[PDB]
Amino acid sequence: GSSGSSGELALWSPEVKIVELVKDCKGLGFSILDYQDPLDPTRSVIVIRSLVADGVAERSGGLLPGDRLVSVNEYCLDNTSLAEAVEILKAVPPGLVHLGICSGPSSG
């Protein structure tokens, strides 16, 4: 059982956190983008672009800019294309929003 040294994805945590976000008419208050692993270029992940000023994201106090988003309202956003990710957040119904997050390189 020789674990990998200076390799295993550390940028994020192996434990995702479900943040309860209350969507509104306009929708959410955050953004997302497509990322590419520095070791695996053939692999992409969705990150938290940024939290709109006083946006649902910030309000709740669970999301942060730089964290890797797992899913939104039970939606596998793994290796998903930005376009797809955005559409998923737009197609998602209003109200409570159960989305996971992977603590990443935060400057806070």
Residue 107's domain is classified under what CATH number?
A: 2.30.42.10
Give the separation between CA 102 and CA 17, rounded to whole angstroms. Answer: 7
Domain count of the chain? 1
Measured from the Cβ of residue 105, the count of other Cβ atoms closer than 10 Å reads 12
- Which structural domain range is residue 46 located in? 1-108
